[PDB]
């Protein structure tokens, strides 16, 4: 059945003629998930990844050809390109070079490079921005709570793949960029802390990031009129540790309750140098309330 579903998923997958054969991908996926659930043979689960990888490339080619119809349908060679982005399985090279660059579909270039693999720091950091700003783009129609949830699901899914390999998951950059987006969009201060918690990022290493991002004294938080924001992040992160202490290993926790008190003393020296606005007063109260719990966690 797989060797005829391949002959309805080779030449044959979106449709690449455009719309009936995505049923053949989704149905071949259903038949291969049914095969492996009845008879867990290697090869019928090996062919399942072939189909689910083909399924995202298939959706990218649909994102391309409908966007030619939705933007460029008064140009003559869009009929040529529609009949071409019909009849065959185009690889990521064709989809970029023959269609998404000649028509200049930036939305689809971003869609292609989200799929086009991963390779070491600068390109890895661009691709994590591309993945974040695509999911921020294509969610624009939804409320902040739903867009938080969508971006959480994306970054928790891909983070559960790449966080095991710290060349492909640049944690420190992803935290800075997500907090710069939260700081812009006016989302919750618990957000990036929740996303990294639900990936499973070790909470001491998560603190090492916000600690150094605060110590950078980045002009962004100042330019967005939220020069306190990363201290509110550190407060929510450390209150989340204090009222669930299981998030630090039962040997390391005593080393960490020092480092949290040492750092909270540092942030309280910082805060008590600032102009004593109601926010600086409240956050000085929050950090002394946090201190007055950490003093019992030791």
């Amino acid at each position: 059945a797989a060797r005829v579903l391949s002959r309805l998923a080779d030449m044959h997958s979106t449709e690449i003629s455009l719309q009936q054969r995505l049923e053949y991908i989704a149905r071949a996926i259903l038949s291969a998930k049914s095969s492996t659930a009845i008879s867990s043979i290697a090869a019928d689960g090996e062919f399942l990844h072939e189909l689910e990888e083909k399924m995202e490339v298939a959706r990218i080619q649909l994102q391309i050809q409908e966007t030619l119809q939705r933007q460029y349908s008064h140009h003559s060679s869009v009929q040529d390109a529609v009949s071409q982005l019909d009849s065959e399985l185009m690889d990521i090279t064709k989809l970029y070079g023959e269609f998404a660059d000649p028509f200049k579909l930036a939305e689809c270039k971003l869609a292609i490079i989200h799929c086009a693999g991963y390779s070491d720091p600068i390109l890895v950091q661009t691709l994590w921005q591309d993945i974040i700003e695509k999911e921020l783009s294509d969610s624009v129609t939804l409320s902040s709570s739903d867009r938080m949830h969508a971006l959480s699901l994306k970054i928790v899914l891909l983070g559960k793949i790449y966080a095991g390999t710290p060349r492909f998951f640049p944690l420190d950059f992803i935290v800075q960029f997500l907090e710069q987006q939260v700081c812009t969009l006016n989302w919750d201060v618990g957000f990036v802390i929740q996303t990294m918690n639900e990936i499973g990022v070790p909470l001491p290493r998560l603190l090492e990031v916000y600690d150094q991002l605060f110590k950078s004294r980045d002009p962004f938080w100042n330019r967005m009129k939220k020069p306190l924001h990363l201290l509110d992040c550190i407060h929510v992160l450390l209150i989340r540790y204090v009222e669930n202490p299981s998030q630090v290993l039962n040997c390391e926790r005593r080393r960490f309750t020092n480092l949290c008190l040492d750092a909270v003393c540092g942030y309280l020296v910082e805060l008590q140098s600032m102009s004593s606005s109601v926010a600086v007063q409240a956050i000085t109260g929050n950090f002394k309330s946090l201190q007055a719990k950490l003093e019992r966690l030791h």
């Binding site: 990888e53 490339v57 140009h75 003559s76 060679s77 040529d80 390109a81 690889d91 990521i92 090279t93 970029y96 070079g97 023959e98 269609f99 660059d101 000649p102 028509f103 292609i112 490079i113 799929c115 086009a116 693999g117």
Partner: peptide, 19 residues
């Protein structure tokens, strides 16, 4: 194919009739 290859050098004019 999953692999991506950029090749700006020779493309087909999307905006244009075929020769």
């Amino acid at each position: 194919i999953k692999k991506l290859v950029l090749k700006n050098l020779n493309n087909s004019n999307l905006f244009s009739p075929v020769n």
